[PDB]
Amino acid sequence: GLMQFTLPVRLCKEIELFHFDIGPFENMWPGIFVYMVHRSCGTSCFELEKLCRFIMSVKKNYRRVPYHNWKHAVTVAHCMYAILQNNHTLFTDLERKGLLIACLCHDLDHRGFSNSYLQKFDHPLAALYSTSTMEQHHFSQTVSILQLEGHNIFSTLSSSEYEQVLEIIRKAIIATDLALYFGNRKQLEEMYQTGSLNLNNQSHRDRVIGLMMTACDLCSVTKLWPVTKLTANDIYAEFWAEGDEMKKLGIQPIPMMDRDKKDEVPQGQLGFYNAVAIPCYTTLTQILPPTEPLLKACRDNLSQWEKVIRGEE
Ligand SMILES: CN(C)c1nc2cc(Br)ccn2n1
Ligand SMILES: [Br-]
Ligand SMILES: [Mg+2]
Ligand SMILES: [Zn+2]
């Protein structure tokens, strides 16, 4: 009970900032996650023995793909940590517990392919779940791991608190389906501007937690330019692999995914910052003013992609 995790000074300070990079030392990522849980939640939220066993089973069930991997899991959990710490009083005990676990689990057993590719492939998971295919699988794997002997980090919740936290985690993971993001932000935009947004309305919290999840999931666009630039390589390596597999099914992939059309990437990143990222962190800043640094960092990187196009790097 008296066993804190402590990090080296540079990490101890930088981890509090939205733009923190968890680094290339895999073996430190579990301790980073626990540190965050302890400061975000308490030293008491989870039995350390069970948490550690839950973390290492979650790690095992992320695959060795270029981007949708264990590092992404922890990166996305860190962004949620930064949002929760800069918005101390807005979130219940259960939400703080549930959301860091949601973020760590959100891409469990991802194979590096989109919901579209599963459906064109006719992957079994596409028959089991017609929408938010991978996201329903990710929630399914989370529940599977939670039910391994020794792994129930929630065992000390009441029956009804347990049901609420698994419901927070399910909606949180489903919301990482970018197809659902557009409508979810449109509604939050209207609710904010007409003044009807009410954080005591459960259906409204759900929407706001969904946007937080989109923001954490996209947080690679809110890092320092060199982190953003190198992560984009990993993202495009999955896209081009998926484009290769589309060609194998006899389908010309969208250009984003065509490795013959790399030249078009900087313009494609422009489109994405403008269509998805900027609107996402704008609406999030409006709802949760202290998340402004994510918007500012996102704008800085949009500006960096504009420079790539103009031939200035
Ligand atoms: C090109 N689009 C779909 C895309 N998706 C992402 C997600 C993140 Br994080 C960063 C860049 N991109 N680029
Ligand atoms: Br990126
Ligand atoms: Mg995902
Ligand atoms: Zn993700």
Please state, as a whole number, how many other Cβ atoms lie within 10 Å of the Cβ of residue 2.
4
Whether 39 is in a domain gets the answer yes
Cβ atoms of residues 161 and 169 within 8 Å = no
Q: Whose CA is nearest to atom 2 of ligand 1?
A: 272
Neighbour-count burial for 118-153, b at 16+ CB within 10 Å, e otherwise: bebeebebbeebeebbbbbbbbbbbeebbeeeebbb
Question: How many domains does the structure of the chain reveal?
Answer: 1
Task: End-to-end CA distance of the chain: give it in Å, rounded.
Answer: 51
Please state, as a whole number, how many other Cβ atoms lie within 10 Å of the Cβ of residue 224.
14
Q: Which of 258, 276, 278 to mutate to test the pocket of ligand 1 (most atoms within 8 A of CB)?
A: 276
Query: What ligand 1 atom has the least distance to the C-alpha of 268?
Result: 1
Distances (CA, A) of 307 to 197, 223, 261, 269: 38, 17, 19, 12
Cβ atoms of residues 236 and 126 within 8 Å = no
What DSSP character marks residue 15? T
Q: Report d(CA 244, CA 299) in Å as an integer.
A: 32
Q: Report d(CA 126, CA 134) in Å as an integer.
A: 9
Whether 3 is in a domain gets the answer no
Whether 11 is in a domain gets the answer no
Taking CA 148 as the corner, what is the angle to CA 146 and CA 149, rounded to the nearest 5 degrees? Answer: 115
Q: One-letter amino acid identity for 138?
A: H
- DSSP secondary structure string for all residues of 238-260: HHHHHHHHHHHTT-PPPGGG-GG
Closest C-alpha among 235, 206, 216 to residue 281: 216
Whether 264 is in a domain gets the answer yes
CA 83 to chain centre: 12
Q: Report d(CA 307, CA 313) in Å as an integer.
A: 6
Whether 12 is in a domain gets the answer no
Residues 6+ apart with CB under 8 A from 228: 220, 221, 301, 304
Q: How was this structure determined?
A: X-ray
Q: Report d(CA 233, CA 144) in Å as an integer.
A: 32
| Cβ–ligand 1 contact at 256 (below 6 Å) | yes
Residue 269 annotated in ligand binding: yes
What DSSP character marks residue 89? G
Q: Which two tokens stand for residue 43?
A: 């030293």
Helices (H) and strands (E) in the chain, counts: 15, 0
- Nearest ligand to the CA atom of 301: 2
Q: Which two tokens stand for residue 280?
A: 């996402």
With left for phi above 0 and alpha for psi between -120 and 50, is residue 42 left, alpha or beta?
left
CATH number of 126's domain: 1.10.1300.10
**Distance (Å) from CA 139 to ligand 3 centroid:** 11
Whether 247 is in a domain gets the answer yes
Q: Report d(CA 244, CA 78) in Å as an integer.
A: 32
Q: Which of 182, 221, 235 to mutate to test the pocket of ligand 1 (most atoms within 8 A of CB)?
A: 235
Domain extent for 126: 28-310
Residues 6+ apart with CB under 8 A from 106: 73, 76, 135, 138, 172, 173, 176, 213, 217
Whether 7 is in a domain gets the answer no
| Cβ–ligand 1 contact at 218 (below 6 Å) | yes
Residues 6+ apart with CB under 8 A from 304: 225, 228, 229, 313
Question: Has 123 been annotated as catalytic?
Answer: no
Whether 155 is in a domain gets the answer yes
If you search the block for the tokens 């794997």, which residue do you land on?
Answer: 141
Residue 138 annotated in ligand binding: no
Residues 6+ apart with CB under 8 A from 279: 185
Residue 286 annotated in ligand binding: no
Cβ atoms of residues 184 and 132 within 8 Å = no
Instruction: Catalogue the E-assigned strands of 46-184.
Output: none
